[PDB]
Structure formats: C-alpha cells, structure tokens
Design a protein around this ligand. Structure first.
Ligand code: SF4
Ligand SMILES: [S]
Ligand SMILES: [Zn+2]
Length: 422
C-alpha cells in the first residue's frame, strides 16, 4: 500500500551509519532493553493498518537520550504460519535501514537502533516505524501476509512485560532446532540477502551454524526458500564430501562459486584457519586469532572496549568486512559460539581465550553445558579472560597460565593457517 514518510526511504540508504554525535535516540544494544517480534495472530484479534505507540514519543525525550524499545509486529494471513515468523522478523532489519536517518542492527532481544538528529528534524516520529513495517511486510510477502498491525513500545514497564511474550516465542523457535544436526540433514542453504552491503558475500547456513547475523537458522532459510523460490535463500545438497573434519563439500563449493559471482571457490564450515566464511556488514561478533596465546578472542558489535588483538570491534570489522576471505578472522552470530560444530576443526570452544563479560553472561548456561560435554569442566567459563581481567595480552596471559586454560597446551593452532593467495 501507500507509504508517505517525511524522510527519504529506499535501498540507497541501507548502508548508512549514525555516529553518537548525530544520534537523537538510541535504543537497545545493551544500552537499554529492546526487542523485536513477529507473531501469527488470528483475524478477529487484529486491526489491519493499526499502529500504536505506547509510551513517550520522539518529541517527549531529551535529545541524545536512550529509550527501551519493543517492536511488536502481529501478522494475519490465510497462508501464514508460525514457521514463517522468523523469516519476516529478519526483514525488520532492512525495512528500517531503508529509511534515511534510521539505523538498525542485531536480532530478537539484542537488536540495536538509532534515529538521527536529521531524521527527527525532518519529521520522523515512532508511528513511522509502524508505517514502514506495515507497508513493507505486505509488499514483500504478498501471498503470506493479508493483515498487519504494529505496536511500538517505549514505556519501561511495557517493554519489560512484552519482552516475556517475545522470550516465549524465541524459545519456541529454538525448540524446533533441537533435533537437527549437520550429519542428519541432506540439504544446506545459501543466503545472499546482504549482497546489497557486500556484493560477493554468501552465508552458508547449516543446522549447527546460524547465519552470521544470528537471525537466520537452518529452519528460517528453509522456510524462506519455500515461501519464495526466487528468494534470497537456495538449497544446496550435501554431496561430494571432500573433508568431514574441516567441512568441505564439492557441492557447497560449487553453489558458493556461483552465488559469489565467481569470487569464492571454497569455504570450510568448521575452521577459522583456512578458506573461512566471508562476512557482510551485520555479524554479531568477530573471532580473531591470538598467536601468542595459541587461542582465539571474540568481541561483539555492541562492545566498545579494547581487545587483546590490539583493536576494537570496529577496527576489526574494518579488516574482515566486505565479502573477502580472511584466514584467522571470521564474523559470526552469537549463538554459533555454543554450537557443537563451533570451529570444531580447530579444537572448538577450548580455543576461546577472551570475550566480553556481557557475552559470557548472555551465553552463560550454554557455555557451561558445552564445557561439560567436552570435559573442560563447568568452571571453563571462568578460565576464559574478559575485560575485567585485562584488555591486553600482557594482562590476560598470566591469568590464562594461572587458571590453566586448556588452549595454552593444545596443538599450535597457527600451523593450521592456510594463506588466501596462490
Ligand atoms: S548475515 Fe548471512 S544469513 Fe543473515 S541475512 Fe545476511 S547473508 Fe543472510
Ligand atoms: S550486512
Ligand atoms: Zn548482513
């Protein structure tokens, strides 16, 4: 339908970024609680086109301030399913990034948004989030979406409340993923949704490796392909298995070559050290090699602090970004860290020597579960250094020594390291 924003809106603005100095509001990114959700609802419980804002609006908050956020998108459609919810929810990301002076990254309840001083000057107000979502949902998913309603929560209480509604739907999606492993499926999925940001980037999504945005599970990719054969996701048959440990299939290599416009020739699903997966612009975390540690550090998009690699998330994002292949450096989704297949060819989670404490917190129970499953002890999470120990190799290494971090005494990871050239 019709969309009449006071701000430009379209593909050309998607890659915009908004510096703190230009920011009018910010919500999410661990600065305030924030979530987004897409729900199948029945038709009698939905008003098509209705957008409400519950809580303070853009003109009722100091400039440069923070706000908690709940984006709730109720969909009704004759053909609509629960299985599809994760597919539409992903699109909230570019839908918003199309608006000039609107910025969004992350997923679920670690999403992050900013609105620019200019967008506000021009007229933007929270209602417009709703208008964009209503228009675009309808436009992109014609066969699936008959009716759309949007609620934008900015009241502290209501976000806390609807967070639970979301948490519940989230857990429910993850349950569908429980049974499925890489060995026990015969199809993987390619994703190219982000080639607007990196023209040659392709994600290869398997049941044990979520998309680097952490918002496209194997099931999501599958659902997407069923929703639209000409869509951003394609099926890749597992065939021509070259290396079971590294994770190289002749057929994955084949579809990767085509999808990356003859740019990438091989990818290894289970290693960081040779033909690793490339990155677009929305990865949640970056893994970087730490040669002196015989290990790997991780830092996250929303973590501003120094890291023992000597650079911050941004500076790291700088090198690994753009669909180029970078041995020793990889962009990943948060929950990948706790996959069984997490860099399994390099010794798995045992290699992680440093992480932001927030990440540890977010993944706590899984880390502990996986720890036990590889005989690293339940106390393994506490042997991984974080910023409260130090940000430099000089600080963290004696800690690793003292705590007896397993990485220190494994095989030289650096021998694993195949250059990208020749
Ligand atoms: S990060 Fe990867 S899986 Fe997620 S939307 Fe992008 S290309 Fe797809
Ligand atoms: S991206
Ligand atoms: Zn992306």
């Amino acid at each position: 339908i019709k969309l009449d924003l006071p701000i430009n809106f379209g593909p050309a603005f998607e890659g915009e970024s908004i510096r703190k100095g230009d920011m009018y509001v910010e919500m999410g990114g661990n600065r305030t609680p924030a979530f987004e959700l897409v729900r199948t609802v029945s038709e009698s419980e939905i008003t098509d086109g209705k957008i409400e804002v519950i809580g303070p609006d853009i003109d009722q908050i100091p400039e440069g301030s923070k706000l908690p956020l709940g984006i709730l998108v109720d969909i009704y459609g004759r053909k609509m399913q629960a299985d599809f919810e994760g597919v539409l929810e992903r699109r909230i990301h570019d839908f918003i990034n199309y608006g000039e002076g609107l910025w969004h990254t992350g997923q679920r309840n670690i999403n992050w948004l900013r609105v620019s001083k200019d967008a506000v000057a021009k007229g933007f107000r929270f209602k417009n989030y709703g208008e964009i979502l209503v228009a675009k949902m309808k436009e992109e998913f014609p066969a699936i979406v008959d009716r759309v309603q949007v609620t934008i929560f900015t009241d502290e209480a209501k976000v806390k409340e609807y967070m639970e509604v979301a948490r519940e739907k989230y857990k429910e999606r993850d349950d569908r993923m429980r049974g499925l492993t890489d060995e026990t499926v015969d199809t993987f999925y390619s994703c190219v949704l982000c080639q607007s940001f990196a023209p040659n980037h392709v994600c290869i999504v398997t049941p044990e490796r979520v998309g680097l945005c952490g918002a496209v599970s194997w099931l999501d990719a599958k659902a997407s392909y069923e929703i639209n054969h000409a869509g951003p996701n394609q099926p890749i048959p597992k065939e021509g298995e070259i290396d079971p440990i590294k994770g190289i299939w002749k057929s994955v290599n084949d579809y990767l070559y085509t999808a990356s416009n003859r740019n990438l020739e091989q990818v290894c699903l289970y290693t960081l050290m040779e033909n690793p997966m490339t990155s677009c612009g929305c990865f949640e975390a970056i893994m970087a090699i730490l040669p002196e540690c015989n290990g790997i550090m991780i830092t996250t998009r929303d973590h501003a602090g120094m890291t023992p690699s000597g650079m911050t998330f941004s500076t790291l994002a700088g090198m690994i970004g753009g669909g180029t292949q970078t041995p020793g450096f990889m962009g990943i989704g948060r929950t990948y860290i706790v996959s069984k297949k997490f860099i399994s060819a390099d010794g798995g989670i045992a290699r992680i020597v440093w992480m932001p404490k927030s990440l540890k917190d977010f993944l706590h129970d899984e880390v502990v579960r996986r720890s036990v499953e590889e005989g690293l002890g339940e106390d393994f999470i506490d042997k991984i250094a974080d910023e409260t120990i130090g940000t430099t190799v000089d600080e963290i290494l004696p800690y690793l020594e003292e705590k007896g971090h397993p990485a220190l005494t494994m095989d030289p990871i650096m021998r694993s390291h195949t250059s990208r050239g020749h």
